[PDB]
Amino acid sequence: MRDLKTYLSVAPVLSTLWFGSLAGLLIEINRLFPDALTFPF
Amino acid sequence: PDRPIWFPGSTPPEWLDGSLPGDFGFDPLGLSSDPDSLKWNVQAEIVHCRWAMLGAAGIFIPEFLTKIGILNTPSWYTAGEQEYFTDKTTLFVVELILIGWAEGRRWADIIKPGSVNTDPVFPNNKLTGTDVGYPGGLWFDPLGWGSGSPAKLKELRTKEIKNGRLAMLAVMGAWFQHIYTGTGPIDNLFAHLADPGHATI
Amino acid sequence: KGEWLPGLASPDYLTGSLAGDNGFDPLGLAEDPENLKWFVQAELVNGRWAMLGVAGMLLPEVFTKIGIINVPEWYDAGKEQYFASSSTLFVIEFILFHYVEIRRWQDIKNPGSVNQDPIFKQYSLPKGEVGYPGGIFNPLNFAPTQEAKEKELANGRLAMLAFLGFVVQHNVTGKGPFENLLQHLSDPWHNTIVQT
Amino acid sequence: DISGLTPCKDSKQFAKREKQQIKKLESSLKLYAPESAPALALNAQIEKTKRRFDNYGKYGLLCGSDGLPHLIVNGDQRHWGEFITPGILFLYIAGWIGWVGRSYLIAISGEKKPAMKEIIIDVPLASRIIFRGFIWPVAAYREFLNGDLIAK
Numbered sequence A: 001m002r003d004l005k006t007y008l009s010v011a012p013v014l015s016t017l018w019f020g021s022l023a024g025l026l027i028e029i030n031r032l033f034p035d036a037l038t039f040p041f
Numbered sequence B: 001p002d003r004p005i006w007f008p009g010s011t012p013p014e015w016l017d018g019s020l021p022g023d024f025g026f027d028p029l030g031l032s033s034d035p036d037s038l039k040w041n042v043q044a045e046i047v048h049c050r051w052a053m054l055g056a057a058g059i060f061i062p063e064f065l066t067k068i069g070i071l072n073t074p075s076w077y078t079a080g081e082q083e084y085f086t087d088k089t090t091l092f093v094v095e096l097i098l099i100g101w102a103e104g105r106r107w108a109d110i111i112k113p114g115s116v117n118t119d120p121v122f123p124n125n126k127l128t129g130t131d132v133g134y135p136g137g138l139w140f141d142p143l144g145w146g147s148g149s150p151a152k153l154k155e156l157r158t159k160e161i162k163n164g165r166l167a168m169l170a171v172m173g174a175w176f177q178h179i180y181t182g183t184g185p186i187d188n189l190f191a192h193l194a195d196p197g198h199a200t201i
Numbered sequence C: 001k002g003e004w005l006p007g008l009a010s011p012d013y014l015t016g017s018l019a020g021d022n023g024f025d026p027l028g029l030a031e032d033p034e035n036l037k038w039f040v041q042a043e044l045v046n047g048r049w050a051m052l053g054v055a056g057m058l059l060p061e062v063f064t065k066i067g068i069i070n071v072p073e074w075y076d077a078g079k080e081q082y083f084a085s086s087s088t089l090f091v092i093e094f095i096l097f098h099y100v101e102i103r104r105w106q107d108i109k110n111p112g113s114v115n116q117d118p119i120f121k122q123y124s125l126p127k128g129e130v131g132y133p134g135g136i137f138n139p140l141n142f143a144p145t146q147e148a149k150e151k152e153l154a155n156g157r158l159a160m161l162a163f164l165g166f167v168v169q170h171n172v173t174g175k176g177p178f179e180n181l182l183q184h185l186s187d188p189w190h191n192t193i194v195q196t
Numbered sequence D: 001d002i003s004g005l006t007p008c009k010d011s012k013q014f015a016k017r018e019k020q021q022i023k024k025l026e027s028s029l030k031l032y033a034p035e036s037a038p039a040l041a042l043n044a045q046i047e048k049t050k051r052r053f054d055n056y057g058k059y060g061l062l063c064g065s066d067g068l069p070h071l072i073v074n075g076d077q078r079h080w081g082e083f084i085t086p087g088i089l090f091l092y093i094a095g096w097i098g099w100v101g102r103s104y105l106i107a108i109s110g111e112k113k114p115a116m117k118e119i120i121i122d123v124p125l126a127s128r129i130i131f132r133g134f135i136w137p138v139a140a141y142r143e144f145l146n147g148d149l150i151a152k
């Protein structure tokens, strides 16, 4: 559906999807490497 | 317009006019109302059919021959746990490279039809198929059956689609049967044939 | 000329008049003609330097199979003692390369302005293109046809990728570029980036 | 010893903080059977605390008189991982985001109704533009040289 695809490109839905994926990535990154205070490499 | 319908007495969708092979007017949700989605979905269905037919053959023919005792192959469910000549990740990477070259050229033929019909190395060699998803030529149609009158084609292309759909259903059935009953698919058939009234879910 | 990806269209600014033009610019850096003019020279110089770098990093290690010399690895060549201190050599290198690269740079700005010798005025480079000086830089008078330029660019790109591989492998494996090849050739299916 | 600080590995107050935290965690474990899930969670917490303290000891941080790590941001090479490298990474990422936004804004400026492309995003064009920001420093610097960065 073209209209359904248009509704998925509206600002709030796109922002929600982007921020959900971003939060998931950050949570997993902090889960794999906990308590980072310095960049050791 | 007078073709048999999935729901007799009803009205088929407007975008399904009966021009495609294997068309019965089944699209309640309108997932392919626009032409581009229609083409993409047709190509996806054709590829899923062809992989599911290879998978159904490979799941069921080996397992049957093991039961009658001619071969001694392991279960298809745990076939990925045996130890082969190398680690599984290396095989996955080789697969990824080869299938990436194979599928990458298939992507360009969907976007721009008839642009990848020439051999990059030996330009004397060509594919002959006019239709996206039916490539033809000496590689994919060595017997030359894949071309003919529209009557000869709309039968063969409908036979392919009807077989592929059945294979997809069978493959998913085998997966869920092994998940639930915890035994190979052929044992389930013999159990059902032994006591059809009670050998059931 | 050729397409880097069949089924895709070439950019408008890549008209095929340049050597080694395969229409590869997914990120559109060379849209501005000034950017293209600068990047052509950048690619030429980078490839020409990388080819020599790879040739010097590989062959002095191939000696092991033939056993002519005894030379340390390319990553241990610096620590060896030489007739002069490292600082003095670096200073001399800087002094010479400053003049050389400033002389080269002036041709990109105003072509044909640095073709004359500064001390002996009777000596001058024949007129040529921006990145191809010619003259005494081409003693054997080989014709700079487009085929040779395309070969040069292809070799430069391959050598640049080879140098990147040489750098990355040492950080992980810790051995030489040639030793990495023999180990792979011993057991090909077990000795890859996937160690297992 | 910058500013009269001491390394974490030689600090007694750091060890006392670790011991106090571990002892506080261990007093809660005595309330549960060893096989129960809360005991497993408390064991994991204790192990993680020990690992965190060991890692802070290994990285060469500096402690004060309270046994707490302090950060040096003056540019000394011995502490570049505290401020410099994350700063450069953040600058790269922020420049990427800003460059992608500017490119998308410029791309749709010539349309008939540019406002409607801001409330309903054109997904394919943004997706094509998204990858281009990976080389934002070179593009931005060359645009600055050519004079196309600043509006006339």
Ligand code: CLA
Pocket (backbone or CB within 6 Å): B166, B169, B170, B172, B173, B174, B176, B177, B180, B181, B188, B189, B191, B192, B199, B200, B201
């Ligand atoms: C091609 C499709 C197909 C076929 C032929 C079978 C056949 C069979 N299944 Mg089965 N199954 C399927 C799909 C299929 N399944 C799918 C998709 C699932 C996932 C939901 C399951 C889940 C499943 C479980 C959990 C169990 C079986 C079991 C069985 C066997 C006993 C009959 C029974 O109670 O099943 C009931 C069948 C269903 C609930 C699925 C509905 C059938 C699908 C929709 C296809 C319908 C057939 C078709 C329309 C008729 C014409 C084609 C015909 C020639 C097959 C029998 C051999 C049982 C067993 O192990 O046997 C002892 C058992 O416990 N199946």
Ligand SMILES: CC(/C=C/C=C(C)/C=C/[C@@]12O[C@]1(C)C[C@@H](O)CC2(C)C)=C\C=C\C=C(C)\C=C\C=C(C)\C=C\[C@@]12O[C@]1(C)C[C@@H](O)CC2(C)C
Pocket (backbone or CB within 6 Å): B026, B027, B028, B029, B030, B031, B048, B051, B052, B054, B055, B056, B057, B058, B059, B076, B077, B079, B080, B167, B168, B169, B171, B172
């Ligand atoms: C897609 C699929 C299911 C389809 C779903 C349907 C009907 C949806 C229908 C509708 O959309 C329509 C039409 C119109 C809409 O308005 C309404 C709905 C209702 C939404 C099943 C299978 C889809 C895909 C399948 C079957 C995949 C096959 C897998 C293979 C090849 C496996 C191979 C191997 O088994 C071997 C051979 C050997 C082993 O050792 C190893 C492995 C690798 C396991």
Ligand SMILES: CC(/C=C/C=C(C)/C=C/[C@@]12O[C@]1(C)C[C@@H](O)CC2(C)C)=C\C=C\C=C(C)\C=C\C=C(C)\C=C\[C@@]12O[C@]1(C)C[C@@H](O)CC2(C)C
Pocket (backbone or CB within 6 Å): C024, C025, C026, C027, C028, C029, C046, C047, C049, C050, C051, C052, C053, C054, C056, C057, C073, C074, C075, C077, C078, C160, C161, C163, C164, D135
């Ligand atoms: C010059 C060079 C290296 C030279 C090395 C030299 C001299 C080494 C000398 C040494 O060894 C010796 C000799 C002595 C040894 O003892 C010591 C040292 C001194 C160490 C590398 C260039 C290296 C250059 C490299 C790798 C460049 C890679 C660039 C790529 C891939 C660009 C890709 C794109 O650019 C396009 C095509 C289009 C964009 O639109 C799309 C993208 C995708 C962005």
